[PDB]
Design a binder for this molecule. Sequence first.
Ligand SMILES: [Mg+2]
Ligand SMILES: [Zn+2]
Lengths: 95, 123, 55, 50, 130
Amino acid sequence: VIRVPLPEGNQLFGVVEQALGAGWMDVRCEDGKIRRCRIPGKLRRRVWIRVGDLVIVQPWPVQSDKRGDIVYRYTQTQVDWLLRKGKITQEFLTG
Amino acid sequence: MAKPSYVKFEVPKELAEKALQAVEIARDTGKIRKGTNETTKAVERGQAKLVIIAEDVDPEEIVAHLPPLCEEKEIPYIYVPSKKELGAAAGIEVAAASVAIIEPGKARDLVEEIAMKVRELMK
Amino acid sequence: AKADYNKRKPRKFGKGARRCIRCGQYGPIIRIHGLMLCRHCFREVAPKLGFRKYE
Amino acid sequence: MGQKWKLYIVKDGKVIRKNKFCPRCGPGVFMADHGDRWACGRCGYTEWKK
Amino acid sequence: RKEFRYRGYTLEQLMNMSLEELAKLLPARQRRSLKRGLTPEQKKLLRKIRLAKKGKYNKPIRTHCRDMIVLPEMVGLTIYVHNGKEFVPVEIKPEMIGHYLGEFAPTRKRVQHGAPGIGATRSSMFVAVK
RNA sequence: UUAAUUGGAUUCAACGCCGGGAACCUCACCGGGGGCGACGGCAGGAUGAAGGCCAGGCUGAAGGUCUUGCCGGACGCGCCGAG
Ligand SMILES: [Mg+2]
Ligand SMILES: [Zn+2]
């Protein structure tokens, strides 16, 4: 079929609003509470993330409010591919 | 070649010796054609030289084939006591029925004695 | 027959009809005046075949 | 693996074996009893069995 | 102009016609194919169309030979082809004789275009790869 | 875009380049079908293993399987390690 970063384990879907700075990313998920993603060191080299890139992250059971952590990105050949299956509704990106 | 629950006649012992120990010396010189249903065609032709038919096989369905084919051919033969020295007389270790081998060499006086003994004994 | 399912076919033209006499590949094979080698093997065996490079 | 070599019609006192020899090879090797042809089993033969 | 005439000869007027007198009424390619004999597979397939034409073989005809040349035997029935992954029905009608069998079983899905991406032009080539 | 549209090369020094003018093969790619364990040991094996065919179904086509019964004369991926 296809190998896509679905929610495996406890993953989250990160669609960011603004970069306050130094790696903090305010994310706007379907969950509601303002989460603030940060980044590991394996990908800070070869990839390039910005706004509008729906990507996958991972949250942390501490306070479940401001969490998230990048593990892998999405390429433009998947971001809109993930619409027809309805796995994610894009109206969590226009309001 | 029936099972001992078939009283055809008796079984002497010089026959057993000089035709069962008469196979090793007869295998290391010629050609062995073991098994029951392997030689049936060659004796149907009449190719069998020294056929030694057994008494171990059951049930009484494919046990008697040369005795009923006896009165149609010449069959220089003997009767067989058992199976262990019969598989081991030539070849393998399984239950053997009739090691009826063509040209058993260097072992001809045992033929000239026992084949004609069992000739003039019965058929 | 279990000898009818690992046996090839006798081609007689097309890239699959000839292979190098020393390496064994199909593709760029030299057929000038008869010898049948790669373009890669002919280059590291030629000075023993008699050839020389003058220009 | 069972046991199957029999029914080569046979009694006591005389024998007349059921299936004939093979005309292709030497005598001794038998033919089929399929019911429409004597296939000869291995050599190929379709005389529409007699 | 409701009957079908190929070169002045109706269907059942040519249905009984031979195969060497037939080829004078077909273009080059099919006249030559009819002249180097039929391949073995097409023999095996004609020997399954003719049975299905008399009374027997009431069972879907399948095939891989897309090269077979439609003929006045096959007019009326509906045979299959193999377009790479599946067998696709081709209801044979007059005005097909002469054409190739595989000519009616297309093989590439019609293409409909999305939107250019990262590299479709010199303005989005190095401004993406950092 | 597609079932697949196989890959490598990206300034000079990647783009009629991989001697690459591919109908089958070449072929590495998508759909389907069938074969392959030198060698040591295990269930089993001359009451006959491995192993092979005229004819007919299934099949795109095939003793590839099954129907049908003929043959061949010793070994054995149905089991473990290895190769
Ligand atoms: Mg090709
Ligand atoms: Zn070479």
